[PDB]
From a paper:
DEC-205 (CD205), a member of the macrophage mannose receptor protein family, is the prototypic endocytic receptor of dendritic cells, whose ligands include phosphorothioated cytosine–guanosine oligonucleotides, a motif often seen in bacterial or viral DNA. The MR protein family is characterized by a conserved domain architecture that comprises an N-terminal cysteine-rich (CysR) domain, a fibronectin type II (FNII) domain, and 8 or 10 contiguous C-type lectin-like domains (CTLDs). Here, DEC-205 is thought to function as a promiscuous endocytic receptor that captures a diverse repertoire of foreign and self-antigens and internalize them for antigen processing and cross-presentation. Namely, DEC-205, PLA2R, and the avian IgY receptor FcRY are all reported to exist in a compact conformation at low pH and transition to an extended state under basic conditions, although the mechanism of such rearrangements are unknown.
Building on this finding, we observed a large change in the elution profile of DEC-205 at pH 8.0, eluting with a mass four times that of the monomer, suggesting that in basic conditions DEC-205 formed a stable tetramer. We next performed cryo-EM analysis on the DEC-205 tetramer in basic conditions (pH 8.0). Here, the DEC-205 tetramer formed a 115 × 200 × 100 Å toroid shaped particle with a large central cavity and was ultimately resolved to 4.9 Å. The overall architecture of the DEC-205 tetramer revealed a major rearrangement of the second CTLD ring that enabled four protomers to assemble into a prolate toroid with clear D2 symmetry in the 2D class averages and final reconstruction. In contrast to the structural conservation of the first ring, the C-terminus underwent a dramatic rearrangement to form a tail–tail interaction along the median of the toroid. Within this extended confirmation, CTLD8 from one protomer contacted CTLD4 of the opposing protomer and vice versa. The cryo-EM reconstruction was unambiguous for the placement of the 10 (CysR to CTLD8) domains except for CTLD5. Here, the cryo-EM reconstruction suggests that CTLD5 is highly mobile within the tetramer, and the domain could act as an allosteric center for DEC-205’s pH-dependent rearrangements. As observed in the DEC-205 monomer, CTLD9 and 10 were absent from the final reconstruction, solidifying the notion that they are a highly dynamic part of the protein. Broadly the BSA of the protomer 1 and 2 head–head interaction accounted for ∼2300 Å2, whereas the protomer 1 and 3 tail—tail interaction was ∼1500 Å.
Residue numbers in the entry:
A (entry chain C): 30 to 156, 164 to 211, 231 to 341
B (entry chain D): 30 to 156, 164 to 211, 231 to 341, 358 to 390, 392 to 488, 508 to 625, 643 to 689
Write the structure that this text describes.
Amino acid sequence: RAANDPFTIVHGNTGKCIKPVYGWIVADDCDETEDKLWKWVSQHRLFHLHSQKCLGLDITKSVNELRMFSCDSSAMLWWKCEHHSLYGAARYRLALKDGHGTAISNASDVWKKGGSEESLCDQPYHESYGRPCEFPFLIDGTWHHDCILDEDHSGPWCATTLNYEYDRKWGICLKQFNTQTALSWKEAYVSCQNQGADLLSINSAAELTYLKEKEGIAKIFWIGLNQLYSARGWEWSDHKPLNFLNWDPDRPSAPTIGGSSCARMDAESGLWQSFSCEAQLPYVCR
Amino acid sequence: RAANDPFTIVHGNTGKCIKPVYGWIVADDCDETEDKLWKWVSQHRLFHLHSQKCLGLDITKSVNELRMFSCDSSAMLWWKCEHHSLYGAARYRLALKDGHGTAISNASDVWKKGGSEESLCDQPYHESYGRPCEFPFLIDGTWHHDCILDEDHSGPWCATTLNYEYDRKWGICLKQFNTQTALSWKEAYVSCQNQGADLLSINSAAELTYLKEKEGIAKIFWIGLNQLYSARGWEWSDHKPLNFLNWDPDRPSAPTIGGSSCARMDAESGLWQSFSCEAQLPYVCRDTRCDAGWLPNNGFCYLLVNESNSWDKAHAKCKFSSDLISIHSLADVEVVVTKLHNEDIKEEVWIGLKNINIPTLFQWSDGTEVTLTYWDENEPNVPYNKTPNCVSYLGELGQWKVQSCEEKLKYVCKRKKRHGETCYKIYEDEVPFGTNCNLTITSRFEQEYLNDLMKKYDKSLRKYFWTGLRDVDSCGEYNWATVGGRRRAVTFSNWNFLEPASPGGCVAMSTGKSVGKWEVKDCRSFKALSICKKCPEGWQSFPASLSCYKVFHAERIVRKRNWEEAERFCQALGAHLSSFS
């Protein structure tokens, strides 16, 4: 699978790791993962799960103090990866001076993950009509990062907006015919690869004769028939053989120009049109 | 209009322009456009019109020869523009050695166009189901770059494939309901801007009713209603008023998530559905003193009533002997935001807009001057069907929304380029960085106003502007830049997701996609426009200020004297300005 797992950022030279305090960062006191938990969230941001207080840079004076800030504010907070380091606002590295992390923009610093040679940045960010969730979110006056269970919904439920208190539109934490779930085929593919699954692969006619009679399914959906490799005609998500085709007689099926490079299924008659799969439309991934 | 035109590349230092020969480049013999013609074609390639031979880089030996090659081959030919030069294959500049052009990767060479200051790259590339043409193309054994006219078709015709000899799929040279032409809405917009026109702007119900009965038109197409500006709700291609809408009752019309940010028009019943228009689909493009509180603005006065009542009671109260608030310019929004007691951040304001006929068609309660529409991004809140409609100011920016207006709230009503206090002028071309004026911003509403003015002026992408934010110390601190003597604190900052990537330089401002943000680039040489806002003996003194003065009259003196150059004559005695405590 591929999902954002909790981890801890450590320093390479000496055995120091980040420990957040009320408004700052203090010495390591490390090797105990009961409080020191960090995760990646949208806008390329770092979030501490326990303290629920994110870090940022406030450049307003001569020396910008690196303190804690509210994750819902105009703080201009985001961090990115350099070859063996991390840079924040503008070429600002998380410089360490034996006890506190500051921003001096020094080119002698290294950060890795706990007990593993890794740049803590090789894994990209992972995540109402089945829209992708927004992490974090402020509910009941407290911050939350994961789709937590409660007594209101059946299982996990997340927010589908930046401010749930003003919009009030939630969704199911999608970890399978998702009807009325119109997403882009590329977005659908990356979402179902985040879940560890792959797109539908039609191998025999029995699967099609079972799906055509299905009641709880949209009349139009995606299957995954597309050419990710520009030098070959048509493939599936996984490496499945191409023996069963269901092409369309109505459209001339233009190869590259005049038509498009995605397949669109019609289940009322079982037909495959050529179309552009960048718009929002239901699908299914096995 | 915006289309590609043939031109010539000339050297800046030496008066030489490019001239092609059978397989190489020769001396200038310039100032005659009968044979020397060059143009830009796809894959960032340069094409000669007459000789029909393009240039490329064949890296095969120690010294890569810069000869002529066929545009249909594996030559890896493409060229790009650096700040004041041309680089080709791999940082290889078209170096000149007095007659022949080679690739030595030298940093001292300039190239401009014919008789004008330009980097010959400011104009981007311009160009069977109405697909865009492919330039150039090999037909009848010869290369061709434009849709020429022959006796086969009616007018101009081009190719829609890289190899027309193997595909045989042509198309009409599109220079208007283009039925059976499924294109993307962004592609349709860029193609119709290439033609100089704009998307369909529906102003009255007459044009819409005329389009209903149209036979030669697709049942599904785009209109152009989209939000290119992320801080406002919905606009057209040009700057047309938003008074006529035909929204749909079936879908809940999610503002930004759950739905989309595009509109699609259904003509079988006349509805506007929220959707994403990235797929292919057909389209169509064509000094009064006022009484006790009422603040005056160009003759009339405005004032907010401190009563919290419903919509009908507000419509009946001061329509007092007054009329409701009417926005017709940009200064009135500033008057509303500056007043209203810090805007009462968590509250609402009323404004009178009426609509009785179906579908929705907003008209002013007193007048018909619908010019400016400032809606929240993006909550139109247009219901399915309702005779009483109402509009409300929300947010500190003063955006327009549609509430249910069944509760009690306050309102404002009234009684009986340039902006109002300062002008704003923009030039034609600005290659250097601020050699005449430096624009400085202090507040957010000024940013919104300049963005609106730039949207009214600028109409395409690939454009940049200048803002007074830079630093010469190369230390990392960013503040409001000036011509020297600026120490104010930055009160507002609107950056992109990850905009700052350089520890210095001068910022820019784009209006293509992320409109209204301070883009960051290097400040070495970046061509971008900018807008500018338009007693021992003979002594007289008194110790009344603990200082001995020495001043002169204006008649007994030889020339008029002031305190300016006094440091040249009195500093010899330890003297300074007029020191009063």
